[PDB]
Design an enzyme around this catalytic site. Sequence first.
Site, PDB file in Angstrom:
ATOM      1  N   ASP A  34       0.821  -1.206   0.000  1.00 55.41           N
ATOM      2  CA  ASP A  34       0.000   0.000   0.000  1.00 55.41           C
ATOM      3  C   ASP A  34       0.856   1.257   0.000  1.00 55.41           C
ATOM      4  OD1 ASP A  34      -2.589  -1.032  -0.159  1.00 55.41           O
ATOM      5  OD2 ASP A  34      -2.648  -1.445   2.001  1.00 55.41           O
ATOM      6  N   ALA A  40      -6.509   2.929   7.951  1.00 59.91           N
ATOM      7  CA  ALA A  40      -5.098   3.240   8.167  1.00 59.91           C
ATOM      8  C   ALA A  40      -4.961   4.010   9.481  1.00 59.91           C
ATOM      9  CB  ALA A  40      -4.545   3.959   6.944  1.00 59.91           C
TER      10      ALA A  40
HETATM   11  N1  LIG Z   1      -1.747  -2.995   4.253  1.00 62.59           N
HETATM   12  C1  LIG Z   1      -1.211  -2.561   5.514  1.00 62.59           C
HETATM   13  C2  LIG Z   1       0.013  -1.735   5.235  1.00 62.59           C
HETATM   14  O1  LIG Z   1      -0.318  -0.630   4.543  1.00 62.59           O
HETATM   15  C3  LIG Z   1      -0.374   0.475   5.386  1.00 62.59           C
HETATM   16  N2  LIG Z   1      -1.513   1.170   4.897  1.00 62.59           N
HETATM   17  C4  LIG Z   1      -1.425   2.262   4.243  1.00 62.59           C
HETATM   18  C5  LIG Z   1      -0.231   2.916   3.944  1.00 62.59           C
HETATM   19  C6  LIG Z   1       0.794   3.393   3.755  1.00 62.59           C
HETATM   20  C7  LIG Z   1       2.089   4.002   3.527  1.00 62.59           C
HETATM   21  O2  LIG Z   1       2.612   4.612   4.748  1.00 62.59           O
HETATM   22  C8  LIG Z   1       2.054   5.781   5.425  1.00 62.59           C
HETATM   23  C9  LIG Z   1       0.786   5.595   6.339  1.00 62.59           C
HETATM   24  O3  LIG Z   1       1.048   5.283   7.651  1.00 62.59           O
HETATM   25  C10 LIG Z   1      -0.141   5.329   8.315  1.00 62.59           C
HETATM   26  N3  LIG Z   1       0.169   5.516   9.677  1.00 62.59           N
HETATM   27  C11 LIG Z   1       1.008   6.394  10.131  1.00 62.59           C
HETATM   28  N4  LIG Z   1       1.063   6.335  11.400  1.00 62.59           N
HETATM   29  C12 LIG Z   1       0.279   5.414  11.791  1.00 62.59           C
HETATM   30  C13 LIG Z   1      -0.048   4.924  13.023  1.00 62.59           C
HETATM   31  N5  LIG Z   1       0.453   5.363  14.125  1.00 62.59           N
HETATM   32  N6  LIG Z   1      -0.893   3.952  13.055  1.00 62.59           N
HETATM   33  C14 LIG Z   1      -1.409   3.493  11.982  1.00 62.59           C
HETATM   34  N7  LIG Z   1      -1.136   3.949  10.837  1.00 62.59           N
HETATM   35  C15 LIG Z   1      -0.290   4.899  10.696  1.00 62.59           C
HETATM   36  C16 LIG Z   1      -0.878   6.535   7.730  1.00 62.59           C
HETATM   37  O4  LIG Z   1      -2.131   6.180   7.358  1.00 62.59           O
HETATM   38  C17 LIG Z   1      -0.018   6.864   6.508  1.00 62.59           C
HETATM   39  O5  LIG Z   1      -0.780   7.074   5.403  1.00 62.59           O
HETATM   40  N8  LIG Z   1      -2.569   2.661   3.890  1.00 62.59           N
HETATM   41  C18 LIG Z   1      -3.425   1.832   4.331  1.00 62.59           C
HETATM   42  C19 LIG Z   1      -4.796   1.783   4.277  1.00 62.59           C
HETATM   43  N9  LIG Z   1      -5.494   2.664   3.672  1.00 62.59           N
HETATM   44  N10 LIG Z   1      -5.392   0.814   4.869  1.00 62.59           N
HETATM   45  C20 LIG Z   1      -4.704  -0.088   5.451  1.00 62.59           C
HETATM   46  N11 LIG Z   1      -3.426  -0.096   5.533  1.00 62.59           N
HETATM   47  C21 LIG Z   1      -2.744   0.859   4.969  1.00 62.59           C
HETATM   48  C22 LIG Z   1      -0.433  -0.025   6.735  1.00 62.59           C
HETATM   49  O6  LIG Z   1       0.256   0.869   7.440  1.00 62.59           O
HETATM   50  C23 LIG Z   1       0.350  -1.293   6.611  1.00 62.59           C
HETATM   51  O7  LIG Z   1       1.701  -1.052   6.634  1.00 62.59           O
END
Ligand SMILES: NC[C@H]1O[C@@H](n2c(C#CCOC[C@H]3O[C@@H](n4cnc5c(N)ncnc54)[C@H](O)[C@@H]3O)nc3c(N)ncnc32)[C@H](O)[C@@H]1O
Lengths: 259, 259, 259, 259
Positions: free
Chosen positions: B45, B157
């Site tokens: 992603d 996310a």
């Molecule tokens: N498939 C899972 C992997 O994909 C990632 N991911 C992504 C992405 C990406 C690229 O990195 C930046 C993202 O870090 C997320 N993020 C930051 N700080 C975070 C925290 N403290 N807690 C959870 N999140 C956090 C924010 O949202 C940023 O945009 N987008 C999505 C989505 N839409 N849905 C599900 N997973 C998603 C996820 O993080 C996993 O790694």
Amino acid sequence: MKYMITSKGDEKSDLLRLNMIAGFGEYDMEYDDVEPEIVISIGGDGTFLSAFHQYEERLDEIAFIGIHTGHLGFYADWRPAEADKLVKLLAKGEYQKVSYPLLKTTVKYEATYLALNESTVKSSGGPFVVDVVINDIHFERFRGDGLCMSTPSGTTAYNKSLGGALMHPSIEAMQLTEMASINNRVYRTIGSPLVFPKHHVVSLQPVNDKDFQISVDHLSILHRDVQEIRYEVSAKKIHFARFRSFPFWRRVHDSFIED
Amino acid sequence: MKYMITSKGDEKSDLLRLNMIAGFGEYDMEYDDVEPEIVISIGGDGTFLSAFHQYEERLDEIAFIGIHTGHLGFYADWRPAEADKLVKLLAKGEYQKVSYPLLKTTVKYEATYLALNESTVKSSGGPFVVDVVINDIHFERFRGDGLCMSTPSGTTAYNKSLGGALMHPSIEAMQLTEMASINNRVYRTIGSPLVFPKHHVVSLQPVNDKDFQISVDHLSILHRDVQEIRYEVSAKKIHFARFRSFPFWRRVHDSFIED
Amino acid sequence: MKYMITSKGDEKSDLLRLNMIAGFGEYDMEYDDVEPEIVISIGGDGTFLSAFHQYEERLDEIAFIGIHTGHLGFYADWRPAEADKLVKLLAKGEYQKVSYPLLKTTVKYEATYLALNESTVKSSGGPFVVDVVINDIHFERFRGDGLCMSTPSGTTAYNKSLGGALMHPSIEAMQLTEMASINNRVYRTIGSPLVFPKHHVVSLQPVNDKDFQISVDHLSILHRDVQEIRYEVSAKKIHFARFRSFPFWRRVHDSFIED
Amino acid sequence: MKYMITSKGDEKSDLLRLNMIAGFGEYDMEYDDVEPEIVISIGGDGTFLSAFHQYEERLDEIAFIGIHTGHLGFYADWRPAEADKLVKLLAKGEYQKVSYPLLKTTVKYEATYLALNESTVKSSGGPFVVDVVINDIHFERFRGDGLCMSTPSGTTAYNKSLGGALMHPSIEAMQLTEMASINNRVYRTIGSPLVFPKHHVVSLQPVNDKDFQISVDHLSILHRDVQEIRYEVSAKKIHFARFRSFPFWRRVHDSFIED
Ligand SMILES: NC[C@H]1O[C@@H](n2c(C#CCOC[C@H]3O[C@@H](n4cnc5c(N)ncnc54)[C@H](O)[C@@H]3O)nc3c(N)ncnc32)[C@H](O)[C@@H]1O
Ligand SMILES: NC[C@H]1O[C@@H](n2c(C#CCOC[C@H]3O[C@@H](n4cnc5c(N)ncnc54)[C@H](O)[C@@H]3O)nc3c(N)ncnc32)[C@H](O)[C@@H]1O
Ligand SMILES: NC[C@H]1O[C@@H](n2c(C#CCOC[C@H]3O[C@@H](n4cnc5c(N)ncnc54)[C@H](O)[C@@H]3O)nc3c(N)ncnc32)[C@H](O)[C@@H]1O
Ligand SMILES: NC[C@H]1O[C@@H](n2c(C#CCOC[C@H]3O[C@@H](n4cnc5c(N)ncnc54)[C@H](O)[C@@H]3O)nc3c(N)ncnc32)[C@H](O)[C@@H]1O
């Protein structure tokens, strides 16, 4: 036009109702509690909820108005001091309408119900187990205290206390929240609240016990030999009489942050 | 038609990309990373997020496809084994498009940004104070770690980890969540996540310090002399290439409950 | 010494129990379910909870052991493969004891109860209202679904699903959590879980209805004409037989993160 | 005896401090800010936190008193109207002492710190990854915004905003809470707050980046080439001067429910 007024039943509400009927008598306005075109609730949000269910079979032909004799309500958002002004602007027809989405609930053993706030499913003691099916695919096996499916305007009620998001009522959707789910290697739930658009169907299906406490707004019913509980955004909507701008986020701020 | 493929940069992604280019060479398909009509992301992603921002000025003329060389992603939802099948069905044009809403962010000192996941505002150390204004009326004075405004597809996310609800991407909306707010007699916030429809504008305004850490998706920028941060659902949308049914709630179940 | 073994009642537990009795017959060990010095539970944490309440009047003279025929339990933390080894090391007396604190519950109309996990108070339908008094001063007026007071070892059970903290059982304390409280200008609760030391008394007092659903561990009782519910850390403790190091945080990790 | 008074620095605090020095001059009380036996903080809880760290090397020989010139504080729990009464009862020595536990923090590259509220670890941008080790066994691999380890009296501060439980300060313990952890098939954390007794050691260990933002109370330090962060309940305690009963749960009620 035909109108009716329901009252909470205390002294303040009964005599504000008697004064509004008196003011309505000074206009071409007929009191009819069988086929009213205007339904006025005087009391709290609970009084309004009763008025909605009292006339849920003529929703498309009724405009609702809520007056709060106590604190501000999300449906009873009119102050009693503006009661006399409500009479004239509403006898003339100087108002349009705003409509909030509703939740349709189907219980199969079949019965259908409309909810203005939410519909919940709970166990007949301790925790219960139901399979959650979204659009005919199995989503999770929930074990816990219960589940809650809320309308947009209902998100400030039971849904809020369960951690759900507050949704503006212009969004046609429904929101599902969990009631103390047990999460472990065996049982796994999403945890987060889920917001569904129109035409999406959420189905709750029994696993072991088939006796559940099913609620729709203020009414709580124990249901037996239940085979399925289905939720979806209703095609029907509740219609409010609009005389003035009182935005949803203003009512949220006034109710929970400070008035 | 013109296409391009971006890669995460590891061995598996680089050589799946080289194989797809080889298969594309067997069709009337020209590789062009300046004006592609098809953008393929191979990785996770995060790789897809980079591809979206790499071509955010030609969104209306691009269909995105995501391939996950690791675990299933919400944007990279295609398995590498289906890569060869992706080539043919996409050279023929045997596909329609699905579009997810985006978040518009305006920063005034003026700069505009589009977010596919979310945009967050944080302090330059410790807690910060901002006034939250919804549609030109003051809603709350927030003191805490930060705020997060998420798109529908972004709710799985950062929004999910902050307690927000999961919204189906067919709902054109944005969701605001709080980051460790202090709530007492002095400072009072709503606590619940807030979901806003289109045309609603959420404005964050500085109180004391005017230097904030502003993020848009994976990019984090320190901004100085900031006078306002405005959020609203963008008029633009990202367009995906659709070859097969893979429902949003299926991807939620497969990602968080079990595959 | 005198011992007894309770069984979950399935095939696997009944025949592991019959095999342990056979091995015990090969030692100076007498089976007595009236005055046992050793109580062995074979099944799950629920089976152990029943065994504890079956012998709650002789706690100071009993060492408990839990065997899990299914997944790992927090009380049934012995694997069935180690059953034969349990027999010898326990016939010799090659073990010391570890003791976990208990929760004392007093219900006045007066009855006292001991809880190994927790004690909860719920409404006879919808939300209920109780005044919470801590050490004879009024702390809050709670309106919602219920309250839960947990022992340290009970924090991984109902308390965990209600957002409570996980406490190591060497801390003599009790923890109170809320069940879907309504928070507004009228009703105001702390929200956070509260952890109380010994000698602190938490008293729940009825406001309107005086009929409540009171639970102690797996037993749920409807109580009428209730004037007060008092909670405090009990002077009594449950005593476990200790043959090997299995730390509390290991059982937490093995149960909720992965085994 | 030797005493000193620190001030928030505003007009009200500076002149209440000058009046207390004047009243102290009417007694056998010498002003000494090098070796005071009595440290008086006039302002807010933040002013008290500074006073504690200003004299953290002579804790065993100092009794602290907090006066709040603004709203009630958990450490500055004395009203300015009682300032003159504080002088006499404290010149006579008509007081005993109450002691609250402290948190010891060891940072290895080695440096040690004492926290009255909490100590937190955050990333130098975005999310960070640390392995959490409890008593030399690996408990979880955390990915998110940060972690927070709180003292008992600190649970009403940052810990409360992170969902932690409120602990009475007579319990010698520390509490760990999570800051927006990502939970999925890859990364798995406990989620619940964890409460540790004395002699338990929680160790945070870096995975990739070894640069972290480490905070101790109001001070935030960026640390580089960090190999380990260890937390345990300190053997030292802060000593308060006690002139009157003001229970911890009263201060909780007065601060968060209503005064
Ligand atoms: N498939 C899972 C992997 O994909 C990632 N991911 C992504 C992405 C990406 C690229 O990195 C930046 C993202 O870090 C997320 N993020 C930051 N700080 C975070 C925290 N403290 N807690 C959870 N999140 C956090 C924010 O949202 C940023 O945009 N987008 C999505 C989505 N839409 N849905 C599900 N997973 C998603 C996820 O993080 C996993 O790694
Ligand atoms: N104005 C505030 C007063 O109005 C009430 N109210 C109502 C109402 C009503 C009539 O009673 C039944 C409702 O009890 C709510 N409820 C139950 N169990 C609850 C719990 N454990 N926790 C919070 N709620 C709970 C469910 O939602 C039922 O539908 N509706 C709304 C609304 N939409 N938004 C904001 N408040 C609303 C609110 O409860 C206040 O009393
Ligand atoms: N090993 C896991 C299995 O053991 C169960 N279990 C038990 C037990 C038991 C016997 O049933 C009654 C318990 O139901 C729990 N409970 C009720 N309503 C609940 C809900 N809505 N949400 C979570 N809980 C709920 C209450 O706490 C009751 O006491 N005790 C513990 C413990 N101390 N720690 C970890 N698990 C424990 C657990 O439930 C699993 O099934
Ligand atoms: N009386 C209320 C005023 O006192 C403050 N306060 C303090 C203090 C102080 C001096 O500043 C630094 C503190 O900022 C807190 N903090 C940081 N980031 C925070 C966030 N995102 N969310 C909540 N907190 C946060 C951390 O805990 C730091 O230690 N200590 C306590 C306490 N023990 N209990 C109750 N309040 C307390 C409180 O913040 C109010 O301002």
